[PDB]
């Protein structure tokens with residue numbers, strides 16, 4: 001709403017409106033519609049074909065204000081647009097189209113050709129957000145109208161399966177509205193209005209949006225199975241690849257604290273290729289999905305070793321010991337976060 005329209009867009013948006021309307025009825029001509037006083041599309045007749053003046057004026061202002069809304073959305077999404085040259089407005093180049101195949105209205109639709117114009121990948125990402133916003137507008141309007149999502153379409157109960165997020169929308173509708181708004185942007189460029197799409201802004205939510213404040217769950221064996229001497233081994237399998245830590249913990253490990261933050265646990269974070277005990281040090285490489293991590297402790301000479309898919313992991317130096325020396329204490333139990 002707060003978007004203000006620059007004077008040249010104010011000059012140009014009306015002719016964009018009726019030019020894309022003539023285009024738009026050319027699309028329904030491709031679909032096979034013909035002009036008729038009746039509204040029913042099933043009998044192939046629809047009065048949207050004729051020019052804007054003889055169009056139902058409520059459909060006319062609907063099309064006009066949706067054109068303005070689309071260009072204001074272009075403005076609001078941070079995509080600046082300039083004027084290429086006065087030649088783009090001076091020229092009125094036209095494709096020849098047979099009158100019988102064209103509409104009844106005298107004003108002949110076809111704009112400057114699509115082949116001459118080129119659409120950049122940034123420009124296509126732009127019309128992606130345009131289709132997103134158009135779908136949101138349609139959904140919000142029907143929601144104030146009272147319509148509600150339903151798997152089976154029901155006009156009587158105002159239930160429509162198309163009231164879904166655009167990422168979840170059906171590919172047919174996505175491609176249809178994508179191409180319509182794409183061709184609208186194509187005409188915008190054809191009138192010599194080069195819109196400079198801003199570069200994609202790198203924003204990562206980092207998966208942190210977990211349900212409730214629970215950030216990680218720690219799984220450990222019972223404190224009674226603590227080992228105080230000998231050689232021990234167990235395997236940890238990574239179904240996914242992500243923020244996990246595996247290793248050995250003392251009976252006093254706190255469930256709320258992360259493994260390796262304090263002295264109670266000795267862990268290996270392969271997601272960052274990071275070893276953890278009272279801090280983080282670089283050790284080993286990163287795992288992928290399906291990798292099996294072998295955790296070995298020798299509690300006679302107080303060493304710990306890790307293997308990823310069989311090969312022994314190494315720290316920055318050539319040493320194979322994740323933790324070279326540590327006290328016996330109360331023992332160690334397998335643990336994973």
Ligand SMILES: Nc1ncnc2c1ncn2[C@@H]1O[C@H](COP(=O)(O)OP(=O)(O)OP(=O)(O)O)[C@@H](O)[C@H]1O
Nearest residue numbers: 028039041046047048049059060062063138177180
């Ligand atoms: N004649 C038209 N006038 C205005 N918008 C139209 C017209 N035809 C299609 N649209 C737009 O394309 C969408 C496709 O609608 P659909 O294929 O169900 O046919 P429609 O009966 O013309 O639609 P609607 O009554 O919702 O405008 C519509 O929701 C609307 O946004």
